[PDB]
Amino acid sequence: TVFRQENVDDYYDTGEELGSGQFAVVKKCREKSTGLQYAAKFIKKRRTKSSRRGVSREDIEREVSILKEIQHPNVITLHEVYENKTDVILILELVAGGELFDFLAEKESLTEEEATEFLKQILNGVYYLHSLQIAHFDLKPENIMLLDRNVPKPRIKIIDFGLAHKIDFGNEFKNIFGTPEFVAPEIVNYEPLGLEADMWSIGVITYILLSGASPFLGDTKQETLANVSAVNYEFEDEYFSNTSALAKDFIRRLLVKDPKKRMTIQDSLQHPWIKPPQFE
Ligand SMILES: Nc1ncnc2c1ncn2[C@@H]1O[C@H](COP(=O)(O)OP(=O)(O)NP(=O)(O)O)[C@@H](O)[C@H]1O
Ligand SMILES: [Mg+2]
């Protein structure tokens, strides 16, 4: 599909940089006609068929097509798309309270209540996506953002649809790979991937929310990946001695190597704790 090829600067003024990855720089912006504020994500296009710099049009089109489908309080929405010869420019809903990652950085470990108030939101965002057969494939504390960081119970949105895929057949085999600390063993072993892989990432996120520690992290990327495939983690007493046994049970049911035996998004919401390119 093609996108609007007008100069983006003719319709928006850009401000502060919000963030960066591989593939993209994200800038705060303001639409001239409405005075509303957005996050403009500039994704660099591939300059030649075989190049490794930039993102293939197929991958950009998949991100845009998934984003266009979304409308849920706990996920980011897509406002408009522009393009020019160098970039595709997604105008996304602005999430202005920073990454869950940075929130967790200053001050590092949450109460079970604070942890479950975030988690319940993440779970209903992911329930929506999975209901739509969308696997996010990049869930991690940097890809969650808070609408306002200065409120006692902040409200979150899932961002970064750069690896997301529609799962039409219950699994796909296109060979996706995110960040070693958060990927499920099936990603590590290059096996067919489905919605289950997001549920593993949620367990890793939950462990970190409760402890401030990463369950699989080794000293190098390859060692983390080995730990992940072996399900090499444990609940350190120093971190978990006063954490409830149900919280551990929740995590233990997500960090399961066989995706068929791992809790589904629906199971996670009924659980008693809750229920009211890749190398060194
Ligand atoms: N809607 C948004 N509002 C506010 N900040 C955002 C938004 N989208 C992205 N960011 C910030 O920009 C960073 C990069 O955007 P992201 O969508 O994560 O890019 P990417 O490079 O394609 N994927 P990755 O390599 O995993 O970062 C994020 O980590 C956030 O800090
Ligand atoms: Mg990202």
Residue numbers in the entry: 2 to 277, 291 to 294
Mind quoting what the paper says about this structure?
Therefore, we determined a new crystal structure of DAPK–AMP-PNP–Mg2+ using a combination of cocrystallization of DAPK with AMP-PNP and MgCl2 followed by soaking of crystals in a cryoprotection solution that contained AMP-PNP and MgCl2, similar to the method used to obtain the DAPK–ADP–Mg2+ complex. The DAPK–AMP-PNP–Mg2+ crystals grew in a high concentration of ammonium sulfate and diffracted to 2.00 Å resolution. c OMIT map contained clear density for the nucleotide, including the β- and γ-phosphates and one magnesium ion. The positioning of the γ-phosphate in the new DAPK–AMP-PNP–Mg2+ structure is such that it is in a ‘kinked’ conformation similar to that observed in other kinase–AMP-PNP structures such as PKA, JNK3, GSK3β, CDK2 and phosphorylase kinase. The adjustment of the occupancies of the γ-­phosphate and the OG1, O2G and O3G atoms to 0.60 resulted in elimination of the negative density in the refinement model, thereby allowing a comparative analysis between nucleotide-bound states. The improved density of the γ-phosphate of AMP-PNP allows a closer examination of protein atoms that are within hydrogen-bonding distance of the γ-­phosphate atoms and also those atoms within proximity that might be involved in the phospho-transfer process. The only protein atom that is within potential hydrogen-bonding distance is Asp139 OD1 (2.8 Å). In the AMP-PNP structure, the Mg2+ ion makes fewer interactions with the protein residues and only coordinates to Asp161 OD2, while other inter­actions are made with the O1A atom of the α-­phosphate, the O3G and O2G atoms of the γ-phosphate and a water molecule. The r.m.s. deviation for these residues between apo DAPK and DAPK–AMP-PNP–Mg2+ is 1.03 Å and that between apo DAPK and DAPK–ADP–Mg2+ is 0.62 Å.
Death-associated protein kinase (DAPK) is a member of the Ca2+/calmodulin-regulated family of serine/threonine protein kinases. The role of the kinase activity of DAPK in eukaryotic cell apoptosis and the ability of bioavailable DAPK inhibitors to rescue neuronal death after brain injury have made it a drug-discovery target for neurodegenerative disorders. The most notable conformational changes occur in the glycine-rich loop region, an active-site region with potential for modulation of kinase activity.
